[PDB]
């Protein structure tokens, strides 16, 4: 399990293209989905400098064919997804194939559906447990062969749905799931303004005196 290099997270902090250019291929592949949202989206910034800066960002974007895959991840109508997630939210407040089997033999939208539904399950199980570090054996996160596109789609829903996926809640929720400190690593890597408030949130909503607990 390969964690992102500190130099890469600084380069995300620094918002500079020259340090991103001198970065190795698996590091670029791991840092990808934020960068392709920086590439194929409407310009948030209108400066003349961000013109060639964005040009150089899309200049280094070639290689790794899976880019096109997550381009499909930014190819769905998202309004139906958010109404479906909201309807599931009020449903919770009141599958012949396996998880890996449905996760592979699928297209983008129902992959989005299953991942948002199980994030809803982990979140309302946090709301139900109230303090106890509960165990969930969600198969698609244990899943040693299928992890990197799972981090990709987690980044995609994190950067799509601002209010229905709040940052600290999804952060502690994937703290409760299986081996996903690297998932939190990706989630704070893709959006640079996450590290200090995720530190705040993890400091409050945990145990106080004994670090020897599970």
């Amino acid at each position: 399990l390969q964690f992102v290099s500190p130099f890469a997270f600084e380069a995300m902090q620094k918002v500079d293209v020259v340090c991103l250019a001198s970065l190795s291929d698996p590091e670029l592949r791991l840092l990808l989905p934020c960068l392709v949202r920086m590439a194929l989206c409407a310009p948030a910034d209108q400066s003349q400098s961000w013109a060639q800066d964005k040009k150089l960002i899309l200049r280094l974007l070639s290689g790794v064919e899976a880019v096109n895959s997550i381009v499909a991840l930014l190819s769905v109508d998202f309004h139906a997804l958010e109404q479906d997630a909201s309807k599931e939210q009020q449903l919770r407040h009141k599958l012949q194939h396996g998880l890996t089997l449905e996760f592979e033999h699928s297209d983008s939208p129902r992959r989005l559906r299953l991942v948002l539904s199980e994030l809803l399950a982990i979140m309302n199980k946090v709301s139900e447990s109230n303090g106890e570090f509960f165990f969930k054996s969600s198969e698609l996160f244990e899943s040693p062969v299928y992890l990197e596109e799972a981090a990709d789609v987690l980044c995609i829903l994190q950067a799509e749905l601002p209010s229905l996926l709040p940052i600290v809640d999804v952060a502690e929720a994937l703290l409760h799931v299986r081996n996903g400190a690297w998932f939190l690593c990706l989630l704070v890597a893709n959006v640079p303004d996450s590290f200090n408030e995720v530190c705040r949130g993890l400091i409050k909503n945990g145990e106080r005196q004994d670090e020897e607990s599970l």
Partner: protein, 254 residues
Amino acid sequence: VYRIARQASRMGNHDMAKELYQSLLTQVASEHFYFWLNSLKEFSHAEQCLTGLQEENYSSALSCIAESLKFYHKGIASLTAASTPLNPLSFQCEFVKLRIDLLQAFSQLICTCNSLKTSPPPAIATTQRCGRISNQMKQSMEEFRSLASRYGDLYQASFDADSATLRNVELQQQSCLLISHAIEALILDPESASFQEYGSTGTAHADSEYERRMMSVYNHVLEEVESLNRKYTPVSYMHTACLCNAIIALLKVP
């Protein structure tokens, strides 16, 4: 040499303060005096790191801010170790803690200004605030206003200081109000500002050079805020550049 070092720390020449604090650190024959001198050394180190800035360069801003925070945190650990029941150093610890919080408000603000270049315009759903940057600068309101309140609380709880120390605390609180007003005039509701600084911006007493440079920075930031009032889009990049230049201008005056 201790008097010279503290005079240099008073005026703002923190490099000679570093060197004389090293000299004191090798010296001296007690526990908490040693920890006190180590804390002062670390503060001088972070302040030299803050003097090493360059205008219109945000990369050096993040780097030197991170160096200043780590040296201040070694210093505040030393100050906490230096505290004694007989002499419960309370002004020093609170002043250093709020200085750390001010520089981290600046760090979150500068990387939040970087977030517009590090995120989408909003999402595909959004097509009058759109994007996570609006929520982030609302959090900046909460942090900066709370920090100004904490500066006021440090002012009210001392009563034993002189005019100069109180005026310096007023300078830090006015910096917090300056950044808060600058942000809530550019991005968060431009509509109900309608002021354009209808008070006096000149003819000051100027009891110290640091006061004068603080007031010049304040007037320049307010001039930039008045000029860039209601011409441009609510998110903008002249707004983020205005915040960046404001943070650089505050951190240039040591």
